[PDB]
Each structure stands twice: as C-alpha cells, then as structure tokens.
C-alpha cells in the first residue's frame, strides 16, 4: 500500500 | 579491456568534448547570472494545468501565444519561509538554457502575487501517462532517463542542485521529448546544502537524517525515477511520510520479477546510502551512469539533439487544446489595491 496520487513536496520534516 | 582500441578513444574523445560543452555552458549561464517582462493584463487567462504556486494555461492577446502562467501569493510564500527558495527558482530558470529545460518566457509581480510565465508545453505530465499506462518498458523509461542523466550533468556542472525529481515535474512535449519543470528547491550550491525539502518518495537518505548533504541527492532521486518508471511505483512505497521514511533509511530495496540485471544493478548503484559508493558521486563522476550497461544502447549526442525516436508522441488537438491535463477547481486571481511584501521581493 502507497500513495498513487499527486505527492505535494515539503518544505520541512 | 571491455573496450577495442576505436571504442576506448572514441569514448574518451566523447568526454572531452562534454567537458568543452559545459565549460562554454558555464560562461553563458555566469553571464547571464550577471546581466538577467510584462503585466497580468496582457493574458486572458484559460485553464488551471496544476496546483500545490498555481499553473494556469494563458494566451498572450497581442500574439495568441499559450504560455503557463505560474501564479504565487507572496504572503503565502512568507509564511513557508519559501522567499529565497522563490528568488531562486526565479534567478536559475532566467540563466539557464537545455533542451529538456522548461524556458522563463515573462516574469513580473504585483500587489499580492509573483508570475512566472513558461512556455507550454501540451503532451502533459509523464505522471499522467505512467499512472494510465501502468510502466513503461526498460527501453521507454530509458529514453526519458537519458535526458534527465543529460539535465543533471548540465545542471551540476553549474552548481546547480535541482531537489524536485519526480514524474509530476515531467512535462513531455509534442515531440515525446521532456520538460523538467518546478524549480522552486534549485540552487545554487558549490558544495553543502542543509534545507529539508523534498518530495518523500524521492528522498535521499542524508537528507531525512538532516545532514549537510550534496548534488549526489538529485542522484539517488534518480534511481527513484527509474525504478517508478520501469515498475509503475516507487522503491519506497507507504501512506505516510514517516512510514516512507523509515523504508528509505532502512534503504532495502526489493525489485519486480521483471527487472532486468542491468536495469537492477544501475539501481543497486545510485540507490546507495553509502555515499562514498553512489554513482555520481564517485571519482569517475557522471560517466559510471553513462557507461553504465543499462545505458549501452543510448547515443547520448542523438538524444540531446532530440534525433531518437521517442517512444510515444502525445496527441495534439491544437494550440491551446488542455486534453492531456487532469481538470482543477479554478479559483478567482485577486489583487489587492494595498501592496504585500514589497520588502521581501524587491530583488523579484
Ligand atoms: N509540477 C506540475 C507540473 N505541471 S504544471 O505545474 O502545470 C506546469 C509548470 C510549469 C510549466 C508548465 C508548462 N506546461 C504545462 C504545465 C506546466
């Protein structure tokens, strides 16, 4: 199991 | 040796002239860098491309030009203390100029956002067609691996880390070739860098153990790609982000049944913690991946002069026609009559 949509960048931890 | 006479000088004589390309590169971006317009009103706007800043197709009304118009609300961007992460994305896609390179067409700023307008580029994202179709084929990924290992290279030798590899930061063009896109984590960068930032399946290891860390990231977000390419998801797969990140740090990589030696050794290669063993990190820099096996068959001097065929070309209904972009809520660009942070993008 995973993530299959858009993944949204981070800007921290 | 694994090469004949011809083949060992032909290949050596190909890296000398790489060496020429990116010295002369290097002059052109510093000047550039040295010696760097227009206004909302001058577009109509069309259609939101994507969101996360904002994309929004827009045609230029003197020309009937399309452009992608990124759109960023300056108090937003304080807030996430992204200002120098956006001055950068800003000052590195004015400078630089590559092939597989989305180019910086406008750039201007008002009361409450900054605009940076591309060119469109209408095939979509490779997102959208890796997810449809499933994978791509060894040689299908392949070809687009090519131009990313070319991308970097020329982006490295600048000092240019870039931090945002992934498929929703692909756009392929009308002639199946790629546009990277986002290069809001680009920087400038002549060793060690510290920010966390990223995209979780795509980090590196020393970036979640908030090392100083170095370009060889933008390497192991390679092998990331690859991998997603050729299987159809990620090495580092979970629905949360700490739960990703403990499979990274762990860094025990299975393969699909149907990877291939090569395929699986280039990775075992550039999906490597240890840093003093990860390709584009070593002595023989970029060219342990470009001679690597899996890389036997690619004319690098064809794919940058965009001479191999490509794979799949994205049907193109017209200039303007969005059919390759997943539809979003549009949304209302409002500009207020107070100015916002004019101290903070004075340099935008
Ligand atoms: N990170 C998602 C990339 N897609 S996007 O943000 O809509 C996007 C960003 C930058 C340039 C583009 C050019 N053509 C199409 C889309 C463009």
Known sequence: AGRTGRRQAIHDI | ?348
Request: with cysteine; hydrophobic share 40%; aromatic share 12%.
């Open chain 2, 1 to 348: 040796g694994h090469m004949g006479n011809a083949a060992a000088a032909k290949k050596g004589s190909e890296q000398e002239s790489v060496k020429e390309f990116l010295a002369k590169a290097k002059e052109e971006f510093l000047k550039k860098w040295e010696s760097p317009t227009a206004q909302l009103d001058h577009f109509d706007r069309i259609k939101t491309l994507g969101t996360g800043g904002r994309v929004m197709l827009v045609k230029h009304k003197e020309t009937g030009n399309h452009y992608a118009m990124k759109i960023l609300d300056k108090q937003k961007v304080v807030k996430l203390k992204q200002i120098e992460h956006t001055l950068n994305e800003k000052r590195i896609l004015q400078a630089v100029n590559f092939p597989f390179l989305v180019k910086l067409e406008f750039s201007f700023k008002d009361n409450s956002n900054l605009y940076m307008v591309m060119e469109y580029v209408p095939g979509g994202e490779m997102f959208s067609h890796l997810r449809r179709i499933g994978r791509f084929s060894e040689p299908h990924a392949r070809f687009y691996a090519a131009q990313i290992v070319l991308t970097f290279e020329y982006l490295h030798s600048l000092d240019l880390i870039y931090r945002d590899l992934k498929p929703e930061n692909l756009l392929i063009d009308q002639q199946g070739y790629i546009q990277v896109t986002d290069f809001g984590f680009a920087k400038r960068v002549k060793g060690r860098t510290w920010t966390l930032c990223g995209t979780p399946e795509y980090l590196a290891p020393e970036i979640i153990l908030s090392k100083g860390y170095n370009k060889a990231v933008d390497w192991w977000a390679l092998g990331v790609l690859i991998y997603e390419m050729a299987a159809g998801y990620p090495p580092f797969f979970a629905d949360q982000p700490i739960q990703i990140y403990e499979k990274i740090v762990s860094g025990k990589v299975r393969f699909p049944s149907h990877f291939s030696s090569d395929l699986k050794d280039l990775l075992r290669n550039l999906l490597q913690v240890d840093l003093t063993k990860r390709f584009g990190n070593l002595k023989n820099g970029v060219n342990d991946i470009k001679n690597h096996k899996w890389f036997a068959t690619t004319d690098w001097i064809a794919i940058y002069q965009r001479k191999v065929e490509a794979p799949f070309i994205p049907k193109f209904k017209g200039p303007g026609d969005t059919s390759n972009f997943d539809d979003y809520e549009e949304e209302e660009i409002r500009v207020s009559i107070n100015e916002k942070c004019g101290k903070e993008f004075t340099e935008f």
